[PDB]
């Protein structure tokens, strides 16, 4: 029993981290086969980041201008290209520790683990969600860019996030591994702000099921509700609409606990209208929305990875 | 910016996990050099665990009765011995991925990362604290025993916990790597309960400093207090006494923020007496006590590991 914010084991990703230096700017890169992926603003001075012309800055660079270090070993860059907001450095050595991997673009509400790195070296690992406003609530400092987010499926690492920048209120924004930003943000040091965020309803429901599985059941009421009536109440409290797709994804937890999804919805409705009355659920005084239905199943059933 | 519950990178420890099977009981082992460490109740049937005589059960075992699997490869056991509540299986092959390591016994209030494993394979990683009542708030299922807790110092893994059992209210208990339990618990399936837990005061203060570093400052008041007067208030609210050793450990965060420790204590005192008035600190509605002063420094300064 017990329920914690669990990250994926980070070992497969640790073996892919390198440091990339261009001039005086150093950040992290991801070394897969004979390519190193990293944020394109490695080629910027501090001055350039206020209004960079990345295409222009990259013309004046050659291969030898990129210093790629994998531990104690320098990797010679033998080609380079830019794909949206990421640079791809071809190196003369394939990473022998390259795991089976995929590049995926995740949807808002889905979760992933972040391996926060500095100078190509890991600092720590934590779990995050892609917020509905396309930010993540991370923990990143200067030099953290190029740190990646990922999910694991048995032996396959699905990379879904590269870190690029921090937005007001201390939230974070970045790209998929094709260099396309999540959200309407740009890699330029100019005033930018995320839109209003919303609560990930399907994840709150998943976490209420995790609470029931752990014997924390005080919030279960005797009612049911329709999907439409629930979504009207959720709208008022800045909760995302619950779709039939979400109901289907909650099926396994609903079947395991014997609580219909719409019954859980009625219990969540009461919590939204009345509060928790200074009570806790799974030790938290707030409803948690950064566990997906699969996160709950993986933690409560002991799914492992190779 | 940002502040999250961060675990250590788990790669060095992943390379040490194996599965140990004796008869029909399978759990996790830790493979360091040519020794595999695991909980001694691997030698028990389900029947034996109600009242095991571990010494007796182990006489009737020989080396070949232990099946140790490291991935796809069986490791031949060539010797065995019992040290308190852990078995030590000597194997014919040294683990080539053995990191620089130490066995340490941590103190209540100190934190560590847990690599939760099943059948020798990792499921996830999360951060925990040794509670003052010598339990940990983990997430463990059947087959999780032998999962370990650890800290990293540059390239050295300090192993501090082996998982053995679950106690009422869904909390967990185990041993150091010498097999000595934390707390007054025994590896027998009989009714056992942890004593009343307390809040780790020095860690709450560390986390308030993390909040200030992140610009969450609303709780800072204009007062100071003496150490004695603070500890009288903390006693009432089931907080551990703050010692001069704790004040000294908080020095770096106090110097960084320019807030004297006893001034922070006055702000914490007001939070204890008045509550947070439905406000949050670093996104939490409750005071958090599972970040040590070093955890805060390591996260907010970007300390990395090799
Ligand atoms: C990568 N190493 C850093 C990570 C930042 C640093 C502090 N916390 C983080 O997550 N990325 C940057 O410094 C990027 C980068 C220029 C400026 N930048 C920012 O994150 C800035 N944010 C913005 O300008 C705004 F408002 F658009 F979000 C900063 C003020 C430094 C937080 C470039 C090329 C966008
Ligand atoms: C190791 N694989 C398991 C981990 C347990 C299983 C469920 N969650 C966990 O953390 N360890 C055990 O099953 C140990 C073990 C016998 C029984 N046991 C327990 O954890 C039991 N607890 C107790 O009997 C009590 F009350 F003392 F805490 C159980 C009721 C199964 C939770 C031995 C040899 C102690």
> Phi/psi class of residue B187: alpha, beta or left (left: φ > 0; alpha: ψ in -120 to 50)?
beta
Q: Do A6 and B125 touch (CB under 8 A)?
A: yes
Q: Is A85 a catalytic residue?
A: no
**Within 13 Å and on the Cβ side, how many CA atoms surround B47?**
1
Q: Do A11 and B7 touch (CB under 8 A)?
A: no
> Phi/psi class of residue A162: alpha, beta or left (left: φ > 0; alpha: ψ in -120 to 50)?
beta
Q: Which residues approach ligand 2 with their CB closer than 6 A?
A: A 1; B 27, 41, 44, 49, 140-145, 164-167, 172, 187-192
Experimental approach taken: X-ray
Work out the number of other CB atoms within 10 angstroms of the CB of residue A64.
9
The residue of chain B nearest to residue A124, with distances taken between CA atoms, is B8
CA distance B217 to B129: 25
CA distance A278 to A218: 13
The residue of chain B nearest to residue A210, with distances taken between CA atoms, is B139
- Chain B residues touching residue A115 (CB < 8 angstroms): 9
Q: Do A10 and B11 touch (CB under 8 A)?
A: yes
Closest CA to B124 of A132, A4, A35, A265: A4
Q: Which residue has the tokens 């992140």?
A: B214
For atom 16 of ligand 1, which residue has the closest CA?
A189
3-state secondary structure of A176: coil
Ligand 1 atom having least distance to the Cα of A140? 10
What sign has the CA pseudo-torsion A236, A240, A246, A251?
negative
For atom 17 of ligand 1, which residue has the closest CA?
A189
Q: Are A39 and A27 in contact (CB under 8 A)?
A: yes
Residue A131 in contact with ligand 1 by CB distance below 6 A: no
CA distance A267 to B249: 45
Q: Do A6 and B286 touch (CB under 8 A)?
A: no
3-state secondary structure of B235: helix
Closest CA to A69 of A102, A118, A113, A115: A118
Structure tokens at A268: 């969540």
Phi, psi at A252, each rounded to 5°: -55, -45
The residue of chain A nearest to residue B4, with distances taken between CA atoms, is A139
Ligand 1 atom having least distance to the Cα of A52? 34
- Give Cα separations from B147 to A68, B117, B151, B279, B283 (angstroms): 36, 6, 14, 37, 30
Q: Do A137 and B285 touch (CB under 8 A)?
A: no
CA distance B276 to B289: 16
Q: Which residue has the tokens 């990362």?
A: B113
Q: Are A161 and A174 in contact (CB under 8 A)?
A: yes
Q: Are B229 and B273 in contact (CB under 8 A)?
A: no
Sheet holding B25-32, edge to edge: B73-75, B66-70, B17-22, B25-32, B35-39, B86-91, B77-83
What resolution in Å is listed for this PDB structure? Answer: 1.7
List, as one string, the DSSP characters of A206-269: HHHHHHHHTT--TT--S----HHHHHHHHHHTTBPPPPHHHHHHTHHHHHHHT--HHHHHHHHH
Catalytic residue among A16, A44, A145, A265: A145
Structure tokens at A110: 């889905």
Collect contacts of A237-244 with beta carbons under 8 A, ≥24 apart: A237/A199, A237/A272, A238/A196, A238/A198, A238/A199, A239/A198, A239/A199, A239/A201, A239/A204, A239/A272, A240/A109, A240/A132, A240/A198, A240/A199, A240/A200, A240/A201, A240/A202, A241/A201, A242/A201, A242/A202, A242/A205
Counts for chain A of helices (H) and strands (E), in that order: 8, 13
Which residues 6+ apart lie within 8 Å of A62 measured at CB? Answer: none
């Amino acid at each position: 029993s017990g329920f914690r914010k669990m990250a994926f084991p980070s070992g497969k990703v640790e073996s892919c981290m390198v440091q990339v230096t261009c001039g005086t700017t150093t950040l992290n890169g991801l070394w897969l086969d004979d390519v190193v992926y990293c944020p394109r603003h490695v080629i910027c001075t501090s001055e350039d980041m206020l209004n960079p012309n990345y295409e222009d800055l990259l013309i004046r660079k050659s291969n030898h201008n990129f210093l790629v270090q994998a531990g104690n070993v320098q990797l010679r860059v033998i080609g380079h290209s830019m794909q949206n907001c990421v640079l791809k450095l071809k190196v003369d050595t394939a990473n022998p520790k390259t795991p089976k991997y995929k590049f995926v673009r995740i949807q808002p509400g889905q979760t992933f683990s972040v391996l926060a790195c500095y100078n190509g070296s890991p600092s720590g690992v934590y779990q995050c969600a892609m917020r509905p406003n396309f930010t993540i609530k991370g923990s990143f400092l200067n030099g953290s860019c190029g740190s990646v987010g990922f999910n694991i499926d048995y032996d396959c690492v699905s990379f879904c996030y590269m870190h690029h920048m921090e937005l007001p209120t201390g939230v974070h924004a970045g790209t998929d591994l094709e260099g396309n930003f999540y959200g309407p943000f740009v890699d330029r040091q100019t005033a930018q702000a995320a839109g209003t965020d919303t609560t990930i309803t399907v994840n709150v429901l998943a976490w209420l099921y995790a609470a029931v599985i752990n014997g924390d059941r005080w919030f279960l009421n005797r009612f049911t509700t329709t999907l439409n009536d629930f979504n009207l109440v959720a709208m008022k409290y800045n909760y995302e609409p619950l779709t039939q797709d979400h109901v289907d994804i909650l099926g396994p937890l609903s079947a395991q606990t014997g609580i219909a999804v719409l019954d859980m919805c009625a219990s969540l409705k009461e919590l939204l209208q009345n509060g928790m009355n200074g009570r806790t659920i799974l030790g938290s005084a707030l409803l948690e929305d950064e566990f997906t239905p699969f996160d709950v199943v993986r933690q409560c059933s002991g799914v492992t990875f190779q």
